[PDB]
Amino acid sequence: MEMEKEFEQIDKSGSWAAIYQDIRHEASDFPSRVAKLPKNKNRNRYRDVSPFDHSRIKLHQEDNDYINASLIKMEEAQRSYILTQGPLPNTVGHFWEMVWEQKSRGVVMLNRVMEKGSLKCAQYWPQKEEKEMIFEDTNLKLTLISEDIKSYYTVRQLELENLTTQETREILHFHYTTWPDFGVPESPASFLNFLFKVRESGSLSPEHGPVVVHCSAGIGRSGTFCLADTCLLLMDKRKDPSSVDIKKVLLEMRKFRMGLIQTADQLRFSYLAVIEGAKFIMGD
Ligand SMILES: COC[C@H]1N(S(C)(=O)=O)[C@H]2CC[C@]1(O)CC2
Numbered sequence: 001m002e003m004e005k006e007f008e009q010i011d012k013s014g015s016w017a018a019i020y021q022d023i024r025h026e027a028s029d030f031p032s033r034v035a036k037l038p039k040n041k042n043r044n045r046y047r048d049v050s051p052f053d054h055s056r057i058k059l060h061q062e063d064n065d066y067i068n069a070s071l072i073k074m075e076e077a078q079r080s081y082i083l084t085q086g087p088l089p090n091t092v093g094h095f096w097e098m099v100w101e102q103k104s105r106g107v108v109m110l111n112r113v114m115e116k117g118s119l120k121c122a123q124y125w126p127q128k129e130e131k132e133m134i135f136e137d138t139n140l141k142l143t144l145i146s147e148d149i150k151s152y153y154t155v156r157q158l159e160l161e162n163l164t165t166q167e168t169r170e171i172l173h174f175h176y177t178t179w180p181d182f183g184v185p186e187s188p189a190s191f192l193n194f195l196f197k198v199r200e201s202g203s204l205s206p207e208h209g210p211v212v213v214h215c216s217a218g219i220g221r222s223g224t225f226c227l228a229d230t231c232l233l234l235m236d237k238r239k240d241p242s243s244v245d246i247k248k249v250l251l252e253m254r255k256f257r258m259g260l261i262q263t264a265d266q267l268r269f270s271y272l273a274v275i276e277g278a279k280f281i282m283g284d
């Protein structure tokens with residue numbers, strides 16, 4: 001079926017939970033043996049969220065190459081994404097090592113450091129220009145260059161230096177700051193505006209390594225971001241945009257990381273975002 005009318009048909013019939021459970025039943029199951037090794041327990045935020053072995057990002061290190069991060073490679077859309085958990089106190093150096101080694105331009109953050117009164121990820125970037133951060137375990141230096149605070153999101157320019165080679169690179173930090181502590185946003189308008197700002201920066205384009213996107217577990221809000229982006233790109237590429245099947249795209253993405261889209265409300269929100277986004281692209 002088309003999307004917008006399949007949407008109204010699920011709303012009127014109140015069957016979002018049944019649709020979402022079907023997705024959960026059909027999703028891929030692949031091994032995640034490296035994630036479960038005892039030496040990696042303090043590298044995982046949640047015991048039930050792990051990268052598959054076949055798609056995990058490897059650190060360029062001979063001691064321990066493990067990070068909780070997955071490469072989502074979308075062949076028809078010609079887009080790739082790295083989805084990862086919010087960094088932990090003992091993985092902030094691994095996080096920036098990955099950004100460096102994978103040649104990423106941008107980092108997309110969809111959570112606040114504290115939500116619901118608890119810590120959802122480490123404070124992994126510097127908050128003042130004159131107070132830079134040094135990660136001694138991976139030999140990197142990170143400096144805040146500039147910050148632009150807007151009503152729904154903040155964009156930061158950061159300098160990452162590989163202290164071993166003295167090479168430097170500019171990284172863009174795109175921080176969506178207004179996702180509610182409970183539920184999903186009422187309108188997708190600010191989330192779509194944010195997606196378009198990431199696109200306009202070059203961070204999603206083939207001349208760079210894959211964008212790094214995270215929330216707390218790296219599957220819920222993060223899944224919503226890449227699912228909406230890929231569906232909108234396919235609607236632009238194809239002769240028949242009504243042929244884009246959001247459930248099929250989500251199942252394809254779940255071949256590369258478990259659990260993408262965590263609730264039926266996140267599934268409904270993803271439909272809403274693609275539907276509204278397709279009107280703004282045109283041609284209107
Ligand atoms: C408690 O939520 C009810 C669910 N339905 S339903 C009846 O379609 O599954 C609507 C859409 C998703 C919800 O989780 C929120 C309202």
